[PDB]
Design a protein around this ligand. Structure first.
Ligand SMILES: Cc1ccsc1C(=O)O
Ligand SMILES: [Fe+3]
Ligand SMILES: [Fe+3]
Length: 298
């Protein structure tokens, strides 16, 4: 498809995709001797993403920034394992995201879920402590002056999670939207909602993102880069699909169904796409959590 770029390697003049398209790390060329990373992946991909990075970046001390959308295990798992190899990097993340890395119980869940994705006999590299990460907290509305032609605005986009932010490059009409629009369905071309904290926040975030100047490139947390009408219509379409799922849930509950029937249907219909980075029971349980949130706020 011409509207979805979904291969490793160069995506635009300044932008490459590192690692696997299902849990990518994006590499921005900020200048002749300066780079940034966006999204923080899963821990087991450390040596893959490192190898890909080194194909493009001859001197990794030139990696100066690492932008992080949110605290989920699949968006920050690389940080302890590659930051020791990136001596000049500054991790840019929201206050709430930073705080999650200070919580011993929060760190435990991240580590447990990431270790469930290790291949047999696979060993992770030396790690620095989660609470020692070279982090600079960023605020809602903050302009990140990353390079002479790279200026990205932080936008709060809670609802998927209570810490989630997105990053908007208005020069390129390019939005790194993490999981705030949901999961893009590669077979059908629609958004699957991912509402795991707050439905009203999720929708309100999409309402605000729809007011941005028209997008040319929309880059979620999974599946690659979307362009053309998929980018221009993304926030609006994500909103619509979330309402569709709420109406579906209310229809079935009205027929006396338990949340478990639709949970299993959504796991059946939707769990295949993420099976290689979401450990066994986590997709089904995530679907149930989402439907619980939807049911309580509707
Ligand atoms: C892609 C996906 C599917 C169920 S949860 C999730 C996530 O990224 O949080
Ligand atoms: Fe997430
Ligand atoms: Fe995710």
């Amino acid at each position: 498809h011409m509207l979805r770029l979904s291969a490793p390697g160069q995506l635009d003049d300044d932008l490459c995709l590192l690692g696997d398209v299902q849990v990518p790390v994006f590499l921005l060329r900020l200048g002749e001797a300066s780079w940034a990373l966006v999204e923080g992946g899963i821990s087991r991909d450390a040596e893959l993403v490192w190898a890909d990075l080194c194909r493009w970046v001859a001197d990794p001390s030139q990696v100066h920034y690492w932008l992080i959308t949110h605290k989920h295990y699949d968006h920050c798992g690389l940080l302890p394992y590659l930051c020791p190899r990136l001596p000049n990097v500054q991790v840019l993340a929201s206050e709430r995201t930073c705080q999650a890395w200070k919580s011993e119980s929060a760190v435990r869940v991240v580590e447990r879920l990431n270790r469930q994705l290790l291949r047999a006999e696979q060993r992770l590299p030396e790690a620095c402590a989660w609470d020692a990460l070279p982090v600079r907290a960023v605020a809602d509305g903050e302009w990140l002056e990353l390079g002479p032609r790279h200026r990205l605005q932080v936008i709060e986009a809670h609802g998927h999670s209570d810490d989630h932010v997105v990053f908007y490059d208005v020069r390129r009409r390019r939005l790194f939207c993490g999981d705030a629009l949901g999961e893009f369905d590669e077979a059908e071309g629609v958004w699957r909602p991912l509402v795991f904290d707050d439905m009203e926040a999720y929708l309100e975030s999409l309402e605000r993102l729809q007011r941005l100047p028209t997008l040319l490139q929309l880059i979620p947390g999974h599946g690659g880069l979307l362009r053309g009408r998929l980018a221009a219509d993304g926030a609006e379409s994500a909103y619509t699909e979330c309402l569709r799922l709420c109406r579906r849930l209310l229809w079935r509950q009205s027929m006396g169904e338990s949340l478990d029937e639709l949970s299993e249907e959504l796991h059946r219909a939707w769990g295949g796409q993420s099976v290689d980075f979401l450990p066994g029971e986590l997709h089904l349980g995530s679907m149930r959590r989402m439907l619980e949130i939807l049911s309580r706020q509707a």
